[PDB]
Every structure is written in C-alpha cells, then in structure tokens.
Design a binder for this molecule. Structure first.
Ligand SMILES: O=C(O)c1cc(=O)[nH]c(=O)n1[C@@H]1O[C@H](COP(=O)(O)O)[C@@H](O)[C@H]1O
Ligand SMILES: O=C(O)c1cc(=O)[nH]c(=O)n1[C@@H]1O[C@H](COP(=O)(O)O)[C@@H](O)[C@H]1O
Lengths: 315, 318
C-alpha cells in the first residue's frame, strides 16, 4: 500500500520505470469524438466492456450509457472521460505509474474534476500507482485542503509540490496527524522550461545553487516525519534536459526518488545521463512522457516503443 | 475594462484598500448550517432576497428554494446548498466595506467538483456586484499548460486577477497575463514575500548580486510586466508581500514606486496593519491591499468585524 512498496511490487510485475502522462487538452477531446462518432464509437465500446469501469463514482449512470447525446449537457463530460479511459486501457500494461496534471482538468469547471476523480478511481481499482502533478503551495492552514483533496478524495499515491514558499509545507502535505497516514511527494528541483532557472540556478547560498539548497531542505524534511519507513518518501522533479544537474542529485542523494519529465515532446534524449545520470533500481527514476504517447495517432504502440527503448538498460 | 481602472473607481467610491478574504472551510459550513437551522434560516431567506442571486448559472433552481435541501427532499444537495449560501451570506453581510474580494482556490476543491460549482457561483455573484476580485491559487507550470489555468481563471470565472508563484520561471507570466489570440490582458500578483515563518530559507537566505531572492524576483516580475505591454492596457503584475515583513515591505515600496501590492496576514497569523504595515507600502491605497480573512468570516458578527477593520484602515490611512 505504501508508495515505496506499491511502486516496488509493480516494478517487478512489469519492470520499466515509465510514467505515462495523461494531460488531455481541448483538442484531444474533440478529435477523439470527431472521429469516434463517425466510427460507431468503437473505442468507447471497447472501454464499456472493460469491467473495472465500475469503481468510477461520478455520473456512473451517464458514463456507462451506450454512445448517445440528446448533444446533451453531458456530451462533453462523456468522451472527455472516455478519452482518458481509452488511453489507460491501452497503455497501462507498459506503465509503472500514471501522472495526471490537475491543470488540464479545471479550465471547463467542475465537469473536469468529475472526470479527474473517475480517472483516479479507475487507476485505483487496477492497482496502478498515481501522481497528481499539481505542484501545490500555500500556508499550513490552507495546504491542508490540498492534502485532503489529493490523498483523501482522489486516493492518489503522491503529488508534486513547489516548496519555494517554505519547506514546512511538507509536514502538512505528507503527514496527517488527525489520522496518522503518511503520503509521498515530489518537490520541484529543476524544471523543464528554457528560462527555467534564473532562480533554480542564478540564485545560491554560499555558492551552492538554489535547486540544491531546495533539494537538500526537502530531504531533511522527510527525515523528520520519518516518511522513508511508513513506506512513503519525498523526491524531486528533475527535468529531462537538465543533464548536468540530474547527475549530481543522483550522486549526493543516491537512494533518492526522481520524477523526470521532458522526453518525447518538449524535445528530449531518452539516453544520455537522464536514464543514465540518475540510474538506480529504475523505479527511483520515473520517466514521464505525455503528449508523445497521448497525441500519437495510435498509442499503446508508442507506449510499447518507449517501454522497449527504455528497457534498453546497458547497465 | 481594465483592472487598474476598475480598482481605481471603486476606491474613490468607498475610500479603503480593505481586501476581504472568503476561505470557507468545513466548520464554517456546518456551523452556518446548524445556526441558521437552529434559529430557522434568518440569513438564507435574506440571501434569497438579494438582487443578484437570480443571476447564478449553476443549480440556480436549487439555491432558490425555501430553506434547504433540508434533508427530506434531496440531502445530496444539502452541502452544496449551505456552502454556497454561507458565501452569499458573507458577501451580502460584508461587501460594502470591500474594495476587493479574494477567494483561495484551496478551500473550494477538497470536496470534489461541488466546491468548484460554489466557487463559480461566488465569482458570478461578485461579478454582477462588480466588485474587484482575486483568485488566490498561486499557480505555476510550464507555459502551454499554464494556459489552462489562464482559461479557468479569466475565462470561466471572469476573475480580475489571480496570484502567481513565478519560481519555475518568469516567462510563465507571458501565458497567464496575456491571451494572445483574443488579444487580451490580465492582472496578477506574484509571490514575493510570504507569511510563512520558515518563509525565508529560500526567499531570503538566497541571493544573486548582493540581493535577496525576493528582490530579484520582483525585478524579474516587473521587467516581464514591461515586456508584455500590460499597464499600457490597464493591467499589471503586482506583489504578494506578507503583513509581518515590515522591512521587505518598505524596501519594495521604496524602490518600486507605483507597484500594486497584495498583503495578507493581519489577524490570524498575528501582526496588525494599524501600524507599519499600511504606513510602509503607503500610496493611493489600491497599491496596498490589506487582506483580512478568517477574522471576519469566522467572527460571529461579520458585518461588524468587517466594519471595525474598515474604519481602522480608514484612520491609519491618513
Ligand atoms: O509534472 C511536472 O512536475 C513537470 C515539471 C517540469 O519542470 N516540466 C514539465 O513539463 N512537467 C510536466 O510535464 C507534463 C507534460 O509531459 P509531456 O506531455 O511529455 O510534455 C506536464 O503535465 C507538466 O506538469
Ligand atoms: O497569496 C496568498 O493568498 C497568501 C500569501 C501568504 O504569504 N500568506 C497568506 O496568508 N496568504 C493568504 O491569506 C489567506 C488567509 O487570510 P487569513 O484568514 O486572514 O489568515 C489564505 O487563504 C492565504 O491564501
């Protein structure tokens, strides 16, 4: 159940340290519909056969109601949801973990959160580890709501956090006193955008860069609260492009957990001190590929490809 | 339109830079629900009479309906019902003293999609009331992903502004404050100095050219607000400067003339603007917004608490 261990069993059961990213945007949804409606809803039908589609708890009465609209108020809700069910049913067998970015589930209103819950409900019935990338941040009082929403409502296994506002965040995010329970988190160390770090790098304390002070601070916080046992942990978000830095964290923080995005789209080099710099028992270095798989004409295949070339561990 | 202008008008209309915070949690809800229901729906019937409650777009048929989904005819709509009403309640009771209202997203998502429906209603309500608004969601992500937050915030909610955590990078602002396909501009407050205690390991103990991070980030915030011609368009990129950081405050105010500042932390985390807080960071007060939240929304007599802070801010403000 604990992350470390849930992530350990599944690693064996399938190897690979791939993390499929499920960030469906507005066009992913209209295309899946545009050419699903004009194909007799074959994929949605394939889904509807699944079975595990029954933990899902929001508008179950609409979700499992054979392909139809009227275009009813629930049209959009339908399809969006199914597009997600579709990807999962065809990619999970290659995934060690699924990572959903909250951001894409909120621009249309509550309808998108409903879907988020059904997705997390789904990934949860299959026993697939999850990551809600929302990189939360706020004051202890407030942060407590993100901890509830994330680990209590969605039953997620972990989530990303931005501790710039202060590292004590984690004590309210990774630990719930009222009921004990410990959770896992991923702190933002080095991100994947070009103007990336004139902060994570140009900034420093005694000439030790900011992403190191931050990386070090985050770890000393998981020492207190003793996550490591309890079967949880606090890891880092280190971009695929940040080759130099990746190799440094893996050396100074050798048994650490890493979540690295940026490959497949966002430009990338799977190999190269990425899956090498950061190597370890692979599940300690999750590679995330979203669009490269989710935007490809016929995925699973893409998945498989990544699985395979990721399975190329000459180590 | 234009945030600066919208902020400018209301100011002269009520003379005050008081930003009320509406961060409703569980106990505010159930207590509201029990009080009201104990003393037979005094405030709800009141809400049900307010003009703009008829313009809500989500489950309008439910919010308008003789006292509660009571539990006997729905139940499942109960929570939604009382939650939303507690908010209408606070806005109806304290809006006259507010220059701006600021809702923290964190309190609207813990219960799933039901809280978002309430949030949307709260924002539609203030919008009809035409009161400046701030969604404190302190967003941050790679651009083109951040656009989604931009849509949710300024398209769906039609909020005048949001708060932003620029740490991952400043270019993120290009996609939050500017649409660039509808040629639109938006306001924002980036986290500079926060009310956390250990709020300085990174914001202070970090430096670049003799400067502490919080200063450089404000500089990066601005240079970016210049690049996007948002200010020429009546929008802007301001700062979140906690109330318990007097020096940093005066510092910022001093070296950054005419900078919109958002400042939370009076009563709840200690402090009191009464003093240095609003003196430091003075100016034609919109520039300096004093967010007072839990001291009003959790107070037994909210219209009363809001007031107190009104005159208090009026006095010190001279
Ligand atoms: O998820 C993250 O923590 C993340 C950190 C970062 O620095 N850069 C970054 O792109 N990401 C994530 O990368 C995801 C997209 O993966 P792709 O679709 O393969 O680009 C987004 O949902 C972001 O949340
Ligand atoms: O950006 C903010 O909203 C914020 C930044 C900060 O550094 N400190 C801080 O307290 N806040 C906000 O202050 C609000 C609470 O106001 P109080 O109830 O008066 O403490 C919270 O909802 C926070 O979102």
């Amino acid at each position: 159940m604990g992350f470390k261990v849930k992530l350990e069993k599944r690693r064996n059961a399938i190897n690979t340290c791939l993390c499929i990213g499920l960030d469906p945007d507005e066009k992913d949804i209209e295309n899946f519909m545009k050419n699903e409606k004009e194909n007799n809803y074959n994929n949605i039908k394939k889904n509807l056969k699944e079975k595990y589609i029954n933990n899902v708890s929001i508008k179950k009465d609409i979700l499992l109601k054979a392909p139809d609209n009227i275009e009813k108020s629930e049209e959009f809700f339908y399809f969006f949801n199914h597009f997600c069910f579709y990807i999962i049913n065809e990619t999970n067998k290659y995934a060690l973990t699924f990572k959903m970015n909250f951001a894409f589930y909120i621009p249309y209103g509550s309808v998108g959160i409903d879907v988020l819950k059904n997705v997390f409900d789904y990934l949860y019935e299959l026993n697939i580890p999850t990551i809600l990338d929302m990189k939360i941040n706020d004051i202890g009082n407030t942060v407590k709501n993100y901890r509830k929403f994330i680990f209590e409502y969605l039953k997620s296994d972990s989530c990303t956090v931005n501790i710039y506002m202060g590292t004590n965040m984690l004590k309210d995010i990774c630990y719930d006193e009222e009921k004990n329970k410990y959770y896992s988190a991923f702190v933002l160390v080095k991100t994947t955008n070009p103007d990336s770090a004139i902060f994570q790098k140009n900034l420093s304390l005694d000439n030790k860069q900011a992403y190191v002070i931050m990386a070090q601070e985050a770890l000393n916080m998981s020492s207190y609260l003793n996550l490591e046992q309890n079967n949880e942990f606090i890891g880092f978000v280190v971009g695929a492009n940040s080759y130099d830095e990746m190799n440094y964290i893996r050396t100074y923080f050798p048994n650490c957990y890493i979540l690295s995005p940026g490959i497949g789209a966002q430009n990338g080099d799977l190999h190269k001190t990425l899956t090498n710099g950061y190597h370890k028992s692979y599940e300690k270095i999750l590679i995330n590929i979203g669009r490269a798989i989710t935007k490809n004409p016929y995925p699973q295949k893409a998945a498989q490809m990544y699985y395979d070339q990721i399975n190329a561990i000459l180590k």
